[PDB]
Symmetry: C2
Subunit: 366 residues, 2 copies
Amino acid sequence: MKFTVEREHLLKPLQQVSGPLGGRPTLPILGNLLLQVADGTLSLTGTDLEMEMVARVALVQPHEPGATTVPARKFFDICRGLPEGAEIAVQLEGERMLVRSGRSRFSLSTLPAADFPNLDDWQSEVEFTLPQATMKRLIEATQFSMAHQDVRYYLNCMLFETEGEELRTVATDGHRLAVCSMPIGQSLPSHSVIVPRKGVIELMRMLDGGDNPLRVQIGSNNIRAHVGDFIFTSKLVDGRFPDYRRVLPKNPDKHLEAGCDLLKQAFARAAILSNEKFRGVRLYVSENQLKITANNPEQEEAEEILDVTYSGAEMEIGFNVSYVLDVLNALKCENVRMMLTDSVSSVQIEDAASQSAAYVVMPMRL
Amino acid sequence: MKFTVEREHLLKPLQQVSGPLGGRPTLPILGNLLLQVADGTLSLTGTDLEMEMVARVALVQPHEPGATTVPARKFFDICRGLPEGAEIAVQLEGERMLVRSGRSRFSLSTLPAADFPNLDDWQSEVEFTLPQATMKRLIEATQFSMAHQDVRYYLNCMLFETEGEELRTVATDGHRLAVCSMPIGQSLPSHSVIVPRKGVIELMRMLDGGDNPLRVQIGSNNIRAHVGDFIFTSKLVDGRFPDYRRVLPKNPDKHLEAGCDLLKQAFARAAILSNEKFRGVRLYVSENQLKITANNPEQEEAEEILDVTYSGAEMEIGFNVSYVLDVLNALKCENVRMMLTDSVSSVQIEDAASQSAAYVVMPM
């Protein structure tokens, strides 16, 4: 096996293919990457037995076909440590792989490609293509609301749902909820799958922000995403994800509109003197005015008054200010719409200019 | 006690004085700032009992004299969180401090100023002025070489030493040493003091880089630095700091010169295939060439060859690669000079273009 490639043509693929690698593998070859030279292409593969990333690099310089596996971290570090634009020549010599560039030379231990794990074959049932930017939007809009190591294991995941001509993501930790829906211009069966958090992070990070569209293929127990030279596959998780429809307020008719940053900054200052554990703050809403208060067990108190757009009935509502700030940080827009019902009901929050993403936080009695 | 001040005048002093607060809010008053309105000045003081920071802010608006103590991080966070250009009106009400700005209001808990610690009383014995940049250079050139948590407590500190015209810093962990001297244009007495790690961090943090010079006063048990309207004081440490003159090789007359970044990246690549526990690399020095090799228990091997300037006898030497990388990263320079003796002696390393700092590392 032999190839010679420029440093940067290797580095991006090396980054992607190292993502799935577990920190204490149960097999020695799991700490390795599979390298294969075949029909003018180098393929690199990394896996943890549940997800797998493959990257392809076109070979313009002389090469010899063959395959082996190499220590992931050491090979990546050697390649990263060489100077910008360096040419990296790789050749097998018995049971070592030789890496050479200028007068730098490295000899690495190898494990046979015959022993590299293979994911079982599976069939695609649902497929669609979409702009990279649309998938990044769906994931970034909702990822922060996934749980962390909840015993309710499905909450540590993200639901991906197809319906009509739309793709939708839902994330919830059992307390607050995010949902985002985007049209994709293809008629789809009504279908839902649950992707583990490690899978959503890898999928998000393979989207380079460019012009290559993303193709998704969904099977009974797996999902595959293909963009440009990268192909990612993850197992799906089996379970019963909460129905976002049941959590959305049925008629949140009283809309408060406010500047996003002005609102974020008032909540951030009030939060300093909120309860460190439960983080509760109170809203008093009246004609074009909002008052926010917070207090803590040390009897310290904050009060914020600001001009808003509001013409509903006067009312009072409390909630968790960390959850609200999470939402206002994700939204990054000009104006926000807070959609209110009463003191004993949830609040739905949206970009005032867009209904694509919606966030739900629960009321608190303060 | 009442004052009204623009956010912009309050924010950096608040940042400076509250910054260095870590060790224990078990004694709660140590997590609070002492505020005093006296003259037409607001003074802000933080202490951890070992070191003290004090900022003065002129009060140009109506104010009333008096003192209190408020939580430092909370008061900082509120001020930082208000909009650019905010005016901040503060007044004391029974036992809460009220803070009002625009339509934002905050009521903070207070502890009596009577409960705040006295910082201690001492006499200055050595005094000098110097550019902020020179203090930055002196600390940066040697800080990495301090021990981290040595039982020889003085090794986790930096020596400051005056001799002739020069201010000098020395740091060592028993394995490697850094020393840097800079002329400051004043005739100084010969004097050496040991400054704790926390004090050296604060000395670096207080530098705004700009035109204001630094004033230093040293007493038998304290050091003080004054820049602009900020004053930092630290207790000193007792102990017999090693003498750097005995660690410099007596006659390292094998001189090799190389590009700093090239040598750094060669060492960093070779380190990838060195023993994870020992981190050893081997140097082969010969006419105008340096070979660096490394290998590990798996028998994986790295080799780097570089062009170098070297005349004189061939020799081999081993090093902990981390120690040489640390020296090369601290040298922010074009070319380095390694000065060698033999295979079982220390190396001295310097900027090829300046003898103002030197680094000594022991061989493996």
